[PDB]
Design a protein around this ligand. Structure first.
Ligand SMILES: *[C@@H]1O[C@H](CO)[C@@H](O[C@@H]2O[C@H](CO)[C@@H](O)[C@H](O)[C@H]2NC(C)=O)[C@H](O)[C@H]1NC(C)=O
Ligand SMILES: *[C@@H]1O[C@H](CO)[C@@H](O)[C@H](O)[C@H]1NC(C)=O
Ligand SMILES: *[C@@H]1O[C@H](CO)[C@@H](O)[C@H](O)[C@H]1NC(C)=O
Ligand SMILES: *[C@@H]1O[C@H](CO)[C@@H](O)[C@H](O)[C@H]1NC(C)=O
Lengths: 453, 96, 68, 169
């Protein structure tokens, strides 16, 4: 049925059945023994699911390569698979992605027998991308095709934002792109703006349901792509109002742990580039592959391990969770037991920023916790100290936590904060001197005045 | 051929192994050097086929010359085995 | 004789001779002052170190390889 | 160390060292700088030896700076008067570290004078030991039957801060 003119023209790939092999995907066999292209038929269609066929030997790779030239408009394309593996042992699904026709790189490699599951991948930028699923029935080499039970079933393939493809499903639109901050809505009939302090998601176009309000202690960016942190948090207490400042923490810092030897003599140490707030929500802390040049991920906190170099870059701060002094925020907590109790004793502040990427090791995803502290003796603009118990900070598996200490982190004291030492009227003389008793900045110290009694 | 393997700073058990029709590099983190000392009586070249599956392990092929005097890194290979060749002089060139 | 550079610069005097037989090298070296250090080694056929530091008389042993 | 100059034996030792990794492994040109004691006082001049105070920045505390003098006995052609070493002492309240020795910015090598080698040391302990009357008095007078006596402080160490006491008026 023809897509209505109201909805935007959307083309997507969906192959729930395999009675006819799609022209985009082609089959090829790479022999495991000789590592050469056999030119065989790696995968045989069964009408409902595609499985690996038996070649010269079970060790041979069964390649099914699907190539798309471009993407029709950093999650421009979210490809989803449904892989069901009846394989017995030595079961590898080398799902490789070729960015801009580069050398194939396996983003995810499942091991062992697994059930049907959905896996999503992110295409950072538009380019020619080929999805190749390589299967090896057995890692060990044995003579004869004695293992044909190891077959991988992929009966569903979904591709989003594809160029030159069929329109399997059409998404709705009002059809011009609404300005940033306005949620696209077809039933309304006009570009309608989201409420203030809310961020809109482009994955779900219709309605304001995808438009989500910002978290505590945050401000909305003009683009509404992600929330922005004002760097000044104000909370109410019975005594007075506490205004914790973090303006000086906008700049990035370079803190790395001590090198650690591997099982062999190789040594490594983790280095994180942290940008707490500021820059109008721009998370420019990026880690690149300088060693490759002889990619880059944009996040407030950047993860990279460098040997005595630039490898394993993954984003740590993609989505803002919340900002407040409470330990818990949207079900995310920091390991406060590792952080030593601060000397000042004021309630500690913690910042939360969760990364969007989800891996096999991190089923719940990568959530980053940043603990904020204030210390009067820290005369330096900022002293970021790694937790002693977890030098690498990866002991939690998904929560990476550092400790920052600076003078500016103390709350902005009110007027009544400074200690009063006014002298009373005896012998015709009185003195009024005011000085601080945890205060940060604020009005200068008032001078003394003399008056007759 | 001298299959010298040394730790970069035990991996002594990890070195370039004669897997079969092809030799195989060590997967773990160590420096496995395959060196050949051949005295070329005439100017010539070397032609060897090298498979570069992944960028995790780097490949270096430099022929040090007669005086021990020393683009060394080999680019990744996709699809086929690919082909490599460099020029050699009349000196006692030692391939590594 | 030949003179070393009085500057603080690394100047090397290299000879690549192919010994068909095992032999030695016998050379006289003058060391007036310790300001300039003297290094003398032999690198075997696989470029490799075969002690290193030194009118008097000096001599070392060489192998059948293309000693440099 | 009971006068033992174990830092050639001198209180201040002069040695220029090239990087060891660049060489391939460093300790050369050792000469003693502090063999004879000249004098110790806050005055700039002592036995005809002065320090280049113009190179040292004015201290933040503002108290009269201290300078230590130790002259080496060796006399060379370049140094007809001999090697005399000047050490400038300063105190800074914000120097929470036990000691921060900072080289003169104008003369990085410290050999611009030719015979006078001078460094700058800053630490909290360098401040003078304040007396009893140094701490500021903020005693409250007797009005409405209540009075408070609180004492608080450039002082270094000394007697602890006295606590407040309450007494009827
Ligand atoms: C890529 O960038 C530079 C290029 O060599 C290297 O890292 C820097 O190296 C310089 C040279 O000593 C240091 O001064 C810098 O401190 C290094 N950067 C950091 C962040 O420490 C290295 O080759 C690569 N580094 C990274 C981070 O990709
Ligand atoms: C892929 O999944 C998304 C998730 O909502 C869906 O909108 C889209 O229509 C799917 N692709 C196809 C071709 O149906
Ligand atoms: C994506 O890149 C391809 C080339 O790799 C290009 O042909 C295509 O037009 C691009 N898509 C755009 C610009 O939307
Ligand atoms: C050290 O290397 C030797 C040489 O192969 C090996 O036998 C020994 O097991 C190694 N020591 C270890 C692995 O602790």
């Amino acid at each position: 049925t023809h897509c209505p003119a109201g909805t935007e023209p959307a083309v997507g790939f969906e192959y729930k059945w395999w009675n006819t092999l799609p022209s985009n995907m082609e089959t090829t066999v790479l022999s495991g023994i000789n590592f050469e292209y056999k030119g065989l038929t790696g995968w045989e269609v069964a009408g409902d699911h595609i499985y690996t066929a038996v070649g010269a030997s079970d060790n041979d790779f069964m390649i099914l390569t699907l190539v798309v030239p471009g993407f029709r408009p950093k999650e421009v394309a979210r490809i989803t698979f449904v892989f069901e593996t009846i394989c017995s042992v030595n079961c590898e699904l080398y799902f490789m992605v070729g960015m801009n026709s580069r050398t194939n790189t396996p983003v995810e490699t499942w091991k062992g027998t697994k059930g049907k599951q959905s896996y999503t991948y992110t295409i950072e930028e538009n380019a020619t991308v080929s999805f190749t699923w390589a299967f090896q029935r057995t890692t060990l080499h044995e003579t004869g095709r004695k293992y044909t039970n190891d077959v991988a079933k992929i009966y569903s393939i979904n591709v989003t934002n594809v160029m030159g493809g069929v329109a399997s499903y059409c998404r709705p639109c009002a059809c011009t792109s609404c300005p940033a901050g306005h949620y696209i809505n077809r039933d309304s009939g006009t570009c309608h703006l989201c409420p203030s302090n809310t961020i809109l998601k482009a994955h779900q176009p219709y309605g304001a349901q995808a438009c989500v309000p910002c978290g505590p202690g945050t401000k909305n960016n003009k683009i509404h792509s992600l929330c922005y942190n004002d760097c000044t948090f104000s909370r109410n207490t019975p005594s007075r109002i506490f205004n914790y400042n973090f303006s000086a923490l906008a700049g990035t810092v370079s803190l790395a742990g001590v090198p650690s030897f591997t099982s062999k003599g190789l040594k490594y140490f983790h280095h994180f580039t942290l940008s707490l707030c500021g820059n109008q929500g721009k998370k420019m802390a990026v880690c690149t592959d300088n060693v490759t040049d002889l990619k880059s991920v944009t996040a407030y906190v950047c993860q990279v391990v460098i040997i005595p170099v630039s490898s394993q870059p993954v984003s740590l701060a993609d989505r803002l969770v919340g900002v407040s002094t409470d330990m818990t925020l949207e079900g995310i907590v920091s390991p406060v037991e590792l952080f030593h109790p601060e000397t000042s004793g004021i309630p500690d502040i913690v910042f939360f920023f969760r990364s969007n990427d989800v891996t096999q090791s991190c089923s719940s995803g990568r959530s980053t916790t940043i603990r904020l502290r204030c210390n009067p003796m820290k005369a330096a603009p900022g002293t970021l100290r790694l937790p002693s118990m977890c030098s690498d900070g990866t002991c939690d598996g998904c929560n990476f936590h550092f400790l920052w200490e600076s003078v500016a982190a103390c709350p902005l004291c009110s007027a009544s904060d400074y200690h009063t030492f006014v002298s009373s009227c005896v012998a015709g003389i009185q003195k009024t001197t005011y000085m601080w008793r945890l205060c940060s900045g604020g009005i200068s110290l008032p001078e003394q005045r003399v008056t007759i009694c | 051929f001298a299959s010298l393997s040394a730790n970069l700073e035990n991996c002594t058990s990890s070195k370039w192994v004669p897997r079969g029709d092809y030799i195989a590099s060590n997967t773990d983190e160590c420096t496995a050097t395959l060196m050949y000392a051949v005295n070329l009586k005439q100017s010539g070249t070397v032609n060897f086929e090298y498979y570069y599956p992944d960028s995790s392990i780097i490949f270096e092929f430099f022929v040090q010359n007669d005086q021990c005097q020393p683009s060394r890194w080999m680019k990744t290979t996709e699809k086929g085995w690919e082909f490599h060749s460099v020029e050699l002089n009349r000196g006692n060139n030692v391939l590594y | 004789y030949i003179a070393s550079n009085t500057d603080e610069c690394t100047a090397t005097l290299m000879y690549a001779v192919n010994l068909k037989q095992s032999g030695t090298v016998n050379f006289e070296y003058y060391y007036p002052d310790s300001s300039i250090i003297f290094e003398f080694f032999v690198q075997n056929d696989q470029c490799q170190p075969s002690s290193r530091w030194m009118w008097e008389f000096h001599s070392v042993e060489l192998n059948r390889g293309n000693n440099v | 160390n009971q006068g033992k100059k174990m830092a050639v034996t001198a209180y201040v030792c002069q040695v220029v060292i090239i990087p060891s990794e660049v060489m391939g492994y460093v300790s050369s040109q050792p000469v003693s700088l502090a063999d004879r004691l000249v004098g110790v006082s806050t005055d700039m001049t002592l036995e005809g030896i002065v320090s280049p105070v113009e190179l040292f920045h004015p201290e933040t505390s503002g108290i009269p700076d201290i300078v230590f003098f130790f002259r080496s006995n060796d006399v060379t052609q370049s140094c007809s008067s001999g090697r005399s070493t000047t050490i400038r002492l300063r105190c800074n309240p914000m120097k929470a570290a036990p000691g921060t020795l900072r080289l003169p910015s104008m003369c990085s090598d410290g050999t611009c004078d030719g015979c006078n080698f001078h460094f700058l040391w800053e630490s909290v302990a360098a401040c003078p030991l304040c007396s009893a009357s140094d701490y500021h008095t903020f005693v409250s007078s007797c009005v409405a039957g209540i009075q408070k006596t609180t004492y608080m402080w450039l002082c270094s160490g000394g007697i602890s801060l006295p606590e407040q006491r309450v007494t009827i008026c």
